[PDB]
Amino acid sequence: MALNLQDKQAIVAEVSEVAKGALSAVVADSRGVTVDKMTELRKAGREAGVYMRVVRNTLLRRAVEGTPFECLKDAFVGPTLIAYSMEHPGAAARLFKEFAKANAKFEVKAAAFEGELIPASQIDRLATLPTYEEAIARLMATMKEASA
Amino acid sequence: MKVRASVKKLCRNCKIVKRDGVIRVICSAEPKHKQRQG
Amino acid sequence: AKKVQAYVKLQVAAGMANPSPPVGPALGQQGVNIMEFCKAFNAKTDSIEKGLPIPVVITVYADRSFTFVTKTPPAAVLLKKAAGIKSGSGKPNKDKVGKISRAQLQEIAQTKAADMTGADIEAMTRSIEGTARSMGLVVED
RNA sequence: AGCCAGGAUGUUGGCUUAGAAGCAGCCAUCAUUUAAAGAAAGCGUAAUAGCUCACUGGUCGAGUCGGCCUGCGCGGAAGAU
């Protein structure tokens, strides 16, 4: 905590993510370790490189300090710890699914998937955002339905 | 007892208390430290 | 990995798993077997190399039969056998006498990239500089 | 202030020593993952080990810290009809 010209940088980046971000989840790292974040690091690297940033910010004037602009439901995701997993170019492509998997490995917690605000709902682990490009499952029945 | 004209905290654990109008050094960690003004 | 139990890292001998003075029984005695360390450790160690310090951590809880694991070499000793003078200082660190190579310090860290947080392969190297300049080792860069 | 966590890598820095792994010393007192973590402040050891402490993260939700001037008080304060 230097004075104010340091924290505001955090708010700038966080508001940039929340406003200029996408679908995202929480990850409750009460006792964060080396390897949990390392696996999260690989997972974020898969999404187009480094834009699945996950910093340890559960703090009201720090992470809750960008809520008023965008994601105006983060006061209840303001408590003890929420390492919000904000997104960026793309979509939900596999962020929730990958979390839902890596948290179920006993990785510390995600506060019961408190959730971000893409929908008008609060907590619903969905699998309805894996497939967003596939255009070849429609060319599998063309050479088997001509004879008969 | 170190019963001393001069008494003082020695370490972080040493605490100064007066009881019955007398200074004592009382130390949680070190029995040696525990003192007395006399 | 997500949970560790304990580890005693020591520089032991790849050629033969049987030192008396250096470690001998001190290598593992608190549930560790000195008989399981010459029937499996040399099993994987003919497949890379033997002769230099190869630290090992042993997985012994109370069941007497562990699962040996490997390690990675030290980076400050990497500048002794691969960089220049072995010792590094020679004298107390007051006067710069040492040196290193320019093409090296880039590939001599790619081996030990399995224990480096800096994501970029070269951001791994930048850390080496600090390791390589421990005494002020002056690269003719 | 307490109360929950961490208190990590090169590393056990090297010698001289008997052994020296923070803690016998002499001496460099650096660098790394960085929330931070002393080549180490105590204890501890055969020496490791181990135990803390430093700094730092979590709860909590008003005050809090140590200097200056001066008033009055305490101790220092034991003799013999």
Domain-wise residue ranges, chain C: 1-71, 72-141
- At CA C18, angle to CA C15 and CA C22, rounded to 5? 100
Nearest 10 degrees: Cα torsion C24, C25, C26, C27: 70
3-state SS, one letter per residue, for chain A = CCCCCCHHHHHHHHHHHHHCCCCCECCCCCCCCHHHHHHHHHHHHHCCCCCCCCCCCCCCCCCCCCCCCCCCCCCCCCCCCCCCECCCCCCCCCHHHHHHHHHCCCCCCCCCCCCCCCCCCCCCCCCCCCCCCCCCCCCCCCCCCCCC
Phi, psi of B3 (to 5 degrees): -105, 105
C91 interface with A at CB cutoff 8 Å:
no
Distance, in Å, from the CA atom of B33 to the CA atom of B26, rounded to the nearest integer, reads 7
Cβ-proximal residues to C34 (8 Å cutoff; 6+ apart), any chain: C24, C25, C27, C28
In a mutational test of the C interface, the residue from A29, A31, A35 whose CB has the highest number of chain C CBs within 10 Å is A35
Asked if residue B20 belongs to a known ligand binding site, the reply is no
Token representation of residue B23: 């200074």
Cβ-proximal residues to C54 (8 Å cutoff; 6+ apart), any chain: C11, C12, C13, C14, C45, C70, C71, C73
**Which CATH number is C72-141 given?**
1.10.10.250
Residue A121: exposed, middle, or buried by beta-carbon count in 10 A (0-12, 13-18, 19+)?
exposed
Domains C1-71 and C72-141 share a fold: no
A36 interface with C at CB cutoff 8 Å:
yes
Among the residues of C53-114, which ranges form H helices? 78-81
Q: Which residues in C10-21 are b (16+ Cβ under 10 Å) and which e?
A: bebbbeebeeee
C119 interface with A at CB cutoff 8 Å:
yes
Nearest 10 degrees: Cα torsion C28, C34, C40, C43: 100
Residues of C in contact with A33 (CB under 8 A): 2
- At CA C58, angle to CA C55 and CA C60, rounded to 5? 170
**Resolution (in Å) of the shown entry?**
3.7
Distance, in Å, from the CA atom of B5 to the CA atom of B23, rounded to the nearest integer, reads 10
Q: Answer whether C2 sits within 8 Å of A36, measured CB to CB.
A: yes
The answer to whether strand D lies under 7 Å from the CB of residue C78 is no
The answer to whether strand D lies under 7 Å from the CB of residue B5 is yes
| Number of residues that this document lists for chain A | 148
Residues of A in contact with C1 (CB under 8 A): 35
C2 interface with A at CB cutoff 8 Å:
yes
**Which CATH number is A1-130 given?**
3.30.70.1730
Distance, in Å, from the CA atom of C62 to the CA atom of A102, rounded to the nearest integer, reads 30
| A with C: touching (≥3 Cβ pairs within 8 Å) | yes
Looking at domain C1-71, which CATH architecture does it have? Answer: 2-Layer Sandwich (3.30)
Residues of C in contact with A35 (CB under 8 A): 1-2
Distances (CA, A) of A71 to A77, A129, C1, C67: 10, 20, 35, 48
Method of structure determination:
cryo-EM
Strand ranges for C2-127 from DSSP E: 99-100
